[PDB]
Design a protein around this ligand. Sequence first.
Ligand code: HEM
Length: 289
Amino acid sequence: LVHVASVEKGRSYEDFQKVYNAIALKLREDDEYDNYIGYGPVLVRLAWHISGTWDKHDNTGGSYGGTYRFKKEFNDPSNAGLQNGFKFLEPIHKEFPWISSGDLFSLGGVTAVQEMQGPKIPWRCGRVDTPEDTTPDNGRLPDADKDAGYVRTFFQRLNMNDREVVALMGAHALGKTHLKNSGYEGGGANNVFTNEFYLNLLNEDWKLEKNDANNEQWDSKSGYMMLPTDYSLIQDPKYLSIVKEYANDQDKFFKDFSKAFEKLLENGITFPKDAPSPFIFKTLEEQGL
Ligand code: HEM
């Protein structure tokens, strides 16, 4: 199964920077969502969930086909709450109807991370919408109530190693859990990209509590929380070493996150040898906008 990237006809860096800017401007404007968190975190989650269906064994799923637009994937219980991100992007797509759905969803994630003062994430175009029958079945996204062994094994399907996994999980510094979406409640409600996930794991006094949905979670008196899969990163000796590294080196975390997140967004896609190189978008701030 081969998915070859194909650049939207006649489009170049300037076209994609315009789309970036439209998303970034809307992020700034629609700032009231989720008690003033804004849409940044839910867009990062959307990019991850559309990519995280990938299976290295047969090259099914992944960001290429834009299949989240189809009912089966849109209504995956693991995707509860992402409709809010989809709605955010819908007027963007109407203004730029030439962009593919996978390109839009993935670009949304890049734009959100950058606009939240995260690292630059190189991004490549050319995902092509594929038909409804290529939509992966539900159940390929991970459970939260599990341990380190589960996390490790799970991410092997996505061709991610221990360092990639720990880097990617740092995105949990963003946003929050919502009881109605996932059965977990709480979080920092933060919309600036930092390495604070690692600092919080190492520095907070964590208590194992049961929430209103009857699920266990780790809570601190500061008001932070961790999922069991989050906490597993300090229970496993290999993960713990990497957690400590990122807690003590913000730049290293940024660099590793950028590489891992691009890889996540590109899994399953074959780029022809004459495909454009990756784009690095300027932020609104860099443009003076
Ligand atoms: C074992 C892997 C993972 C599990 C079990 C997991 C689980 C969850 C759950 C249960 C929520 C709360 C959803 C809700 O209630 O609204 C959440 C939120 C989030 N996740 Fe993960 N996640 C995982 C990996 C990742 C990765 C790899 C990324 C990105 C690189 C990511 C980014 C986020 C973001 C940004 C939010 C906040 C969304 C919001 O504020 O609306 N997650 N995750």
